[PDB]
Structures are given as C-alpha cells and as structure tokens.
Amino acid sequence: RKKRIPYSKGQLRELEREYAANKFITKDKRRKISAATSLSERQITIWFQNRRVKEKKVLAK
DNA sequence: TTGTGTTTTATTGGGTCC
DNA sequence: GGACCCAATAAAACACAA
C-alpha cells in the first residue's frame, strides 16, 4: 500500500503530447519518454492505460 | 476557505497473443 | 511468453459549488 505521487506539469506535457500522437505507446517511445520524464517504463505504460480509460469515459459523457 | 464529489496514480485480475 | 490489452478498485489529491 505505497502511495501515489502525482506527475508534474512538465511530465504530463510529455505524456499528453505523445498520447495525442498515438493512443498506444511503442517500446521505443516508452524508452524516450522515460528518459525525458524520469518515470519508469512501467509508470508510463500504466499512464497510457489509464489515459485511454479517461478518453473512453469522457466520450460517453 | 471548506466538503465532497471528481480526478489522478497504482494495483489486481481476466483475456489474447496462442 | 512475459508483454500486451482492458475492467474494477482504492487512495491521494484536486476542483469548484457553496
């Protein structure tokens, strides 16, 4: 039960930018986002997974 | 400024790939 | 084959009606 740490503005900007380019992260873009954000590749994957739940939820209104 | 519904991280679990 | 996906869920933090 180790507790969540919200992502900074600069971190979210990199994630959002890449998401807008492709909803599904690739291995190489995951590596590069990790370098650019200091988030682990796992965190990034989880973020994309999470981000598609959000889009799904917001279309549905 | 505050209460609390909403949103954001993070885990767990089932399915495909197979 | 762990690596992907997505759904249900919890807890921390946020957003914004009062």
Author numbering: 217 to 277
Task: Copy out sentences from the published article reporting this entry, exactly as the authors wrote them.
To elucidate the mechanism, we performed structural analysis of two homeodomain proteins, the posterior homeodomain protein HOXB13, and the parahox protein CDX2, each bound to two distinct high-affinity sequences. The optimal sequences for HOXB13 are CCAATAAA and CTCGTAAA that differ from each other by the three underlined base pairs, whereas CDX2 binds with high affinity to similar two sequences that begin with a G instead of a C. Two parts of both HOXB13 and CDX2 DBDs interact with DNA: the recognition helix α3, which tightly packs into the major groove, and the N-terminal tail interacting with the minor groove. Instead, thermodynamic analyses of HOXB13, CDX2, BARHL2 and MYF5 revealed that the two optimal states were bound because of their distinct effects on enthalpy and entropy, principally caused by differential stability of the water network at the protein-DNA interface.
In contrast, the DNACAA backbone is bent towards the minor groove, leading to a contact with N-terminal Arg-217 and Lys-218. Instead of contacting the DNA backbone, Arg-258 assumes an alternative conformation in which it turns inside of the major groove, forming a water-mediated contact with Gln-265. The Gln-265, in turn, recognizes C6’ via a direct hydrogen bond. In addition, the CAA sequence is recognized by a hydrophobic interaction between Ile-262 and the T11 methyl group. The HOXB13-DNACAA structure (2.2 Å) contains chains of water molecules that interact with both HOXB13 amino-acids and each of the DNA bases in the CAA sequence. A relatively large solvent channel (6.4 Å in smallest diameter) exists between the α3 helix of HOXB13 and DNATCG while this space is occupied by well-defined water-net including Arg-258 in HOXB13-DNACAA structure. Thus, the optimal binding of HOXB13 to the CAA sequence can be rationalized by the visible interactions that contribute to the enthalpy of binding (∆H). However, as predicted, the CAA site displayed much higher change in enthalpy, and larger loss of entropy compared to those of the TCG site. These results indicate that HOXB13 binding to one optimal site, CAA, is driven by enthalpy, whereas strong binding to the other, TCG, is due to a lower loss of entropy. The CAA site does not contain a CpG dinucleotide, and thus cannot be inheritably methylated.
